[PDB]
Amino acid sequence: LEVFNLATSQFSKTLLTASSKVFTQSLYTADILSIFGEVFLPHVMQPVS
Amino acid sequence: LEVFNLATSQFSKTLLTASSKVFTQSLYTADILSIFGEVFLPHVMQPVS
Amino acid sequence: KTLYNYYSEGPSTPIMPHLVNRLRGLDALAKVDATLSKVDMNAAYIFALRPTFPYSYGYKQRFSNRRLTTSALCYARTGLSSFLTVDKTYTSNSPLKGGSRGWPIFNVGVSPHVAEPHMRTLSPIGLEVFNLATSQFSKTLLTASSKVFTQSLYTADILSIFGEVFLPHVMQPVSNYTPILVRALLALIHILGSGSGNCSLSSSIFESSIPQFLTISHSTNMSNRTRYCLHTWSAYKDMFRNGIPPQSTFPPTLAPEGSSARILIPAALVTSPMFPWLLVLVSSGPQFFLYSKDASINTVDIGSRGRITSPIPDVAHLDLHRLWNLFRFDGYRYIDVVIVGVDRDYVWPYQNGVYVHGGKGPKGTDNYENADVHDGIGTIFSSFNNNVNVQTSDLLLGLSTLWNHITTTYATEEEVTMAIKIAAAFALVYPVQPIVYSGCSRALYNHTSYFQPSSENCYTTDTAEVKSTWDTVELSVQVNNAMVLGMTLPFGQPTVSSAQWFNNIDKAEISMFKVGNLPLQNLDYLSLDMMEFYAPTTGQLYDIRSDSLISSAHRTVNLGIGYTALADFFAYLASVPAQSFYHNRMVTSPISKQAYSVYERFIERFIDDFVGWGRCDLFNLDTLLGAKRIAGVASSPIPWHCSLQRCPLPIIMHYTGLHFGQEHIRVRVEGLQQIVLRNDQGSIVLDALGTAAPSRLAVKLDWSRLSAWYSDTTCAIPISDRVMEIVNYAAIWDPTQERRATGFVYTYFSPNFLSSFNVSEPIFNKTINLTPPYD
Amino acid sequence: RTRYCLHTWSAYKDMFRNGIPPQSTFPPTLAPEGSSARILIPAALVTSP
Amino acid sequence: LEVFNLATSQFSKTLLTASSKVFTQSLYTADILSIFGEVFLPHVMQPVS
Amino acid sequence: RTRYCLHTWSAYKDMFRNGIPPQSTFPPTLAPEGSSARILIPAALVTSP
Amino acid sequence: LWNLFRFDGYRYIDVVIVGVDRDYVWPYQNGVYVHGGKGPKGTDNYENA
């Protein structure tokens, strides 16, 4: 949802709502957000499977 | 229909996501609509035969 | 409305409200009449930049008995699509077949007027910068900035940049992108080539299609170059610490100034292919010259009967200039490129040997301490280097990306429309107008000052088929100079500047008089949009559904031909003679200045009513009145009776609604006059019947009288003998002339040029049948 | 006769800049010989008579 | 009119933005109204001819 | 006679402190010779007769 | 009658051209070099006023 917000809105921040750095090497850091916004943008726009 | 919905969607076009690649890489980039939606974009905007 | 509606209206009462409602409708038609995104790219370019204008011809005869005529279709086109000169390396002084010794330079200056900005909306980062500007610090004011993303545009440093060098725009967020859009449209049109496919003064030499490959040539003596200085943000900000140095670009810009400007470009966007095309289109131009890679495979020669000769005889020593070379734009003379978000080891990705101030230095060092100035866009951007060969698609990729991004993100539809309307004034280049002369009958030999038939500026080069008897021009040096000096833009303005690259010497003579002016692009808007300081105008990714590059260029060329046609119509209504636009327009007759005075009123009224831009930037009399009659070249003995008319009649009819159908030809009670002349020995010498030509007021009150006037004074032009049917039956009787009798003038096009009208598309290689249908 | 070239999809898209072959290929009717037309056929349909 | 609106606007005059330059650099600074609005400031406050 | 000096805008503003030439130049009517008046003309208008 | 009248006006006037390069050339009388324009020797950015 926050990746979608980054895709559809100009950056603020208030948009960083779910990501955290508490857990090391998890799937919830900012790097994973970058991965999602880079190589999975259409699925972010239209989530299907 | 998925490709049409993607191409007619509203983006923020910031450097965080891949929606900016249409500007930073080239007009003809596959990073949002896949190579197929990009190759067939004009034909799915106006489907005729 | 539709094209069917407009073809059945005709001119009406006041003709200025007419011809502008028609133009707006025709422009609206061109927006939707063809989806060019579903065809091949070359086909799209052909269909956009070279429109066809179909029409049906035909003539009647007095006594027809089993006469067989073909009612076919023809497709009229106007304008030069490129220019053919002698090779830069060519030492002989012999005249080449179809190759001009030089070429015109349409030098455009800088408009003092400012493109009016319109309101924008702040981004959240910009909103917080605004809060910092208008409120005492708290904090609670830091609402959008973050340090999660490294080297992004959302840290506190970018806030400092905005509050330092863009404060007025923070206070009043506005932008206008019309001038860069104008330059982009012109770049596309001049690189590809708009018009009819004619590519020479010879009127019979055509280029088959868009070139596939281009060649870049540099010329120090002939280019119009901009100086560039590359800095990182830290190095650029550090040179203003100890006072203000000379030529400071630091202060913000509301009204752009031609000398010196700064652009702040994020590091992510420097590698975009649009970036060099961004540096071009705001700089001076041309900084390099563009040629078709080889002129043999594209150029053809067309016969009088439509015989295509593919390899023109002397193509080995000819250069095929693009229209890009015939134009000269004044932009910014000095640009400070400031890359934002880079370290002290930053490397210029383009041309080697180029070091960014504050970046990687020559040997191996960081924080380069020199701010080197590079003269010309070619000294950086190796893709613009001398003798570079490039596919046109690769060249245009950056332009298309730039246009798409700007028109979907930064600019509004109004800005794009204004850019189209302005660019249409410089979209096309036309050769000097050729005219013929019927002459006078033998019976009137003693009552005329112009007895013999004649012609002017009628040049052809094909030798395969029969040459037209009216095409008597031979291309000497002085005649070539005169013909180049007679070339015009859509609104009629010529040039008095020209260039020549002969032997091994390149030389340009640039007059202080300019054919027009263009506004500068405020680069602060560009910087702030590229740093996401504004909210985007739209969230769409593609302009295919709205205001694409090729659709915009098609609209621009459509409006440019419309400007040419309406200008010809105005010159007719203002009785502006064709000879007032020749190389010797100043030394021939005092009619020229009066005609300019009358014509400029029509032009300015139209420009204010339709374009809305300040007239003087699009048309003025500076180049007309600064004529340059060169050495000799005597004008042919033709009376000044035909108007300006750069377009064929069917195109003028399309844009004006003028109807010249066969129903206006009389075939069958007394409105004629018996005209009598006597000599000293009381002897009647004329005793002839005559009819009065209509006054322009009568035409104003009844536009069908102009149609009748066409059908009473027009004859089909013969090809092999200089005797028309008309001169055996009719003549012009002007009582206020010392000698009352003259013939007819008839702006001339050429059978070779008219053969190209026989196919729906400007493609002629070998399988095209240009022969007249059914003989 | 007509001239034919056979490509795999991977090889065909790898002969264009950044991949991504052109979107439209229909030529002007007056010049069908000017360019090269293309046909995209899935491997399943190739074996069909 | 833009220059007039700028010069009649309300600022906080803190050291973070350029509105403080009228105090830290000189009374006649171009950093807010450009060199042109600064040169023509008295004449746009009272436009007459 | 009158004495004339010709400057470009860049050169003219670079002969004053921190750039920024003076805002007003109209002299007292009793002393028109005391100072130097200036005229700012765009490059487009210079070529006008 | 032009010769019979004598007018008093400005004695020193600065003419500032706005929007020209450092190689600007005075289109009127030859041998006249604009401050910051083309110099006598063919050099740009003429230093003398």
Residue numbers in the entry:
A (entry chain A), B (entry chain B), E (entry chain B): 197 to 245
C (entry chain A): 71 to 738, 743 to 849
D (entry chain B), F (entry chain B): 295 to 343
G (entry chain B): 393 to 441
Quote the study's own text.
The double-stranded (ds)RNA virus Giardia lamblia virus (GLV or Giardiavirus) exclusively infects G. duodenalis. ORF1 expresses a capsid protein (CP) that assembles an icosahedral capsid. The GLV capsid comprises 60 copies of CP dimers named subunits A and B (CP-A and CP-B) in the triangulation number (T) = 1 icosahedral asymmetric unit. The overall structure of the GLV CP shows a typical α-helix-rich α+β fold commonly adopted in the Totiviridae and other icosahedral dsRNA viruses.
